[PDB]
Design an enzyme around this catalytic site. Structure first.
Site, PDB file in Angstrom:
ATOM      1  N   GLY B  22       0.772  -1.237   0.021  1.00 19.45           N
ATOM      2  CA  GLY B  22      -0.022  -0.017  -0.015  1.00 19.45           C
ATOM      3  C   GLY B  22       1.001   1.306   0.111  1.00 19.45           C
ATOM      4  O   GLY B  22       2.070   1.073  -0.182  1.00 19.45           O
ATOM      5  N   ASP B 136     -14.217  -2.640  12.970  1.00 21.56           N
ATOM      6  CA  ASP B 136     -14.076  -2.852  11.584  1.00 21.56           C
ATOM      7  C   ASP B 136     -14.061  -4.378  11.321  1.00 21.56           C
ATOM      8  O   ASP B 136     -13.634  -4.867  10.349  1.00 21.56           O
ATOM      9  CB  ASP B 136     -12.626  -2.445  11.244  1.00 21.56           C
TER      10      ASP B 136
END
Ligand code: CPS
Ligand code: CPS
Ligand code: CPS
EC number: 2.7.11.1
Lengths: 281, 297
Positions: B22, B136
């Site tokens: 990322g 999450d």
């Protein structure tokens, strides 16, 4: 039994629709059979469009579109017979191995754009293209699902199957989020552009923990291409992800694009009553 | 096992190739050169991590998860750091994702779904009792070991901003609303325990029904369904299971059932057997470790 099809297990069972695995007894092909409440679709406001798009999808044979083999009806049910493929979902490659190389991404992008453009040319727009619609056959060719079927009413799209997408709002163009009506071609093109971004980056272009900021970014198309994107790929992606559908590039322009045309061999294939698509037999 | 002069090295771990990348984080395979253990290491830009108003909460939650050993929680073995990177050393599991079963065979039987749910509820409640809230929970965090036991991932790590965490493997910045409690969507999810519980109820629904309780291609209708907790249990759900799910999927977190009450629910207690398992410097969790490197590479 049902038709020339022998039934296997139930894949999902929703309130007004259900999906069974089956095989064609005459050739052994894998299929799925969706059985849906007939009156739910007949009563629907957009029935003439539904009939037209479904009738069209029956006829279409594109090497990169999931086949709709049969459409039949009872007095209370409609039956769809759909090609079942075995290579899984395209985005599984990212979950397991990270971003694709540029050339592999461009290849899948070429299959996608050609298939989508082909359906558009026959008057059929997906309008809800998501990664879960990008399937792969045994040989690794892209097979796009849900053209025509996506036009059915929501309550019949709830068919007992698991439908989640990582990063749902990313794939929905700003005009589709905000407006009742919209252009199908431009809405599909936005989706394709985000799909290309994810394949080449390995992550979604729009993110923010704060939802208000997320949608603000989507409406401004504020996103950043990673440094490994080429100049030509970045420029094409920025034209596709134009947040104004009035000025957004066309499919024809994408097909003429220099990055797009790299290694591009247009596929050679051939494809040579509507009101009665859902009546009894 | 052998230290490999042509490979990068941190602590007793030799780093392999990058699996995902990322903007601020990468994931690599690695192996312990003392005993051969294969692990995964998430390497994140240190300045990016430290320059956050939530760094205190992050140090605390990461410190806690490093010490936690739960049979249904992915292990964080070690945290090390250089001048510029933080290395989170994490457990691999082989059994894939829980929802793979659904995505291929549809719904599970009541008993098997109830089993995975007991595993999920126990692990989450356990972390809550130690002050760690997930916030999450989604399909991508529900992994399986070779025994087919649930292993919940991202506890601790989920305290990092999703953008800093993002590793190029399609899980961190998903932000899928279907799993998220209405109060959280509304930016008012103060009670992290009730927020996690809602997600767990959505997960239980999927296992037993084979599909999501709230779904819609229209984003406006989707959020509306969520805020109103408008959903229908399929006809195969027992009366007791429906009773429990409706108590969990209450869109008011104040009136929503608590984790403790779920554990004492008569349907949840069926065949229930709570785990038989064991059991500073917090501020220094991310300090330069002085771990030997491999200066060849
Ligand atoms: C303004 C846009 C678009 C809404 C819209 O347009 N919805 C109807 C369209 C579809 N229809 C066919 C029914 C049109 C109806 C006919 S008509 O032509 O009359 O419109 C909608 C789309 C999704 C909505 C979110 C929720 O609010 C709340 C949510 C959490 C926080 O609280 C605030 C942030 C967030 C993420 C919001 C973001 C977004 O910004 C909203 C307001
Ligand atoms: C979600 C899956 C793909 C993922 C997957 O995995 N499918 C099952 C195989 C699992 N495996 C046994 C291979 C894993 C274990 C092997 S392992 O070696 O890993 O242990 C794909 C593959 C075939 C797809 C359907 C068909 O197109 C027909 C139809 C088209 C419509 O338009 C939409 C509806 C429908 C029913 C489609 C839904 C869905 O989109 C399916 C089930
Ligand atoms: C997506 C897969 C599960 C599905 C799958 O693809 N299963 C095939 C198994 C094949 N192996 C057994 C050889 C291992 C994987 C090799 S692979 O080819 O997948 O790189 C799951 C299973 C193990 C998971 C990672 C670990 O939890 C460690 C770490 C925890 C953090 O919180 C989040 C980041 C990270 C790196 C996780 C990422 C991802 O969530 C993984 C790869």
């Amino acid at each position: 039994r049902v038709g020339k099809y022998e039934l296997g297990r139930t894949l999902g069972e929703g309130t007004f629709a259900k999906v069974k695995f089956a095989r064609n007894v005459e050739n052994g092909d894998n299929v799925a059979i969706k059985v849906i409440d007939k009156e739910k679709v007949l009563k629907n406001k957009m029935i003439a469009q539904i009939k037209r798009e479904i009738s069209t999808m029956k006829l279409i044979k594109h090497p990169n579109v999931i086949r709709m083999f049969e459409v039949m009806a009872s007095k209370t049910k409609i039956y769809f017979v759909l090609e079942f493929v075995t290579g899984g979902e395209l985005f599984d490659k990212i979950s397991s191995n990270g971003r694709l190389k540029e050339d592999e991404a461009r290849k899948y992008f070429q299959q996608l754009i050609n298939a989508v453009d082909y359906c558009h040319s026959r008057g059929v727009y997906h309008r809800d293209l998501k990664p879960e619609n990008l399937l792969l056959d045994a040989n690794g060719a892209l097979k796009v699902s849900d053209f025509g079927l996506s036009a059915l009413p929501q309550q019949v799209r709830e068919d007992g199957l698991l439908h989640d997408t990582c990063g749902t709002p990313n794939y929905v163009a700003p005009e589709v989020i905000n407006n009742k009506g919209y252009d199908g071609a431009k809405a599909d093109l936005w989706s394709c552009g985000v799909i290309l971004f994810v394949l080449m980056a390995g992550y979604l272009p729009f993110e923010d923990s704060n939802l208000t900021s997320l949608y603000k970014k989507i409406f401004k198309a504020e996103f950043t291409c990673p440094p490994w994107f080429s100049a030509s790929a970045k420029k094409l992606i920025k034209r596709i992800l134009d947040p104004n559908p009035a000025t957004r590039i066309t499919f024809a322009e994408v097909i003429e694009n220099e990055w797009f045309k790299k290694g591009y061999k247009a596929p050679k294939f051939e494809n040579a009553d509507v009101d009665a698509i859902f009546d009894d037999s």
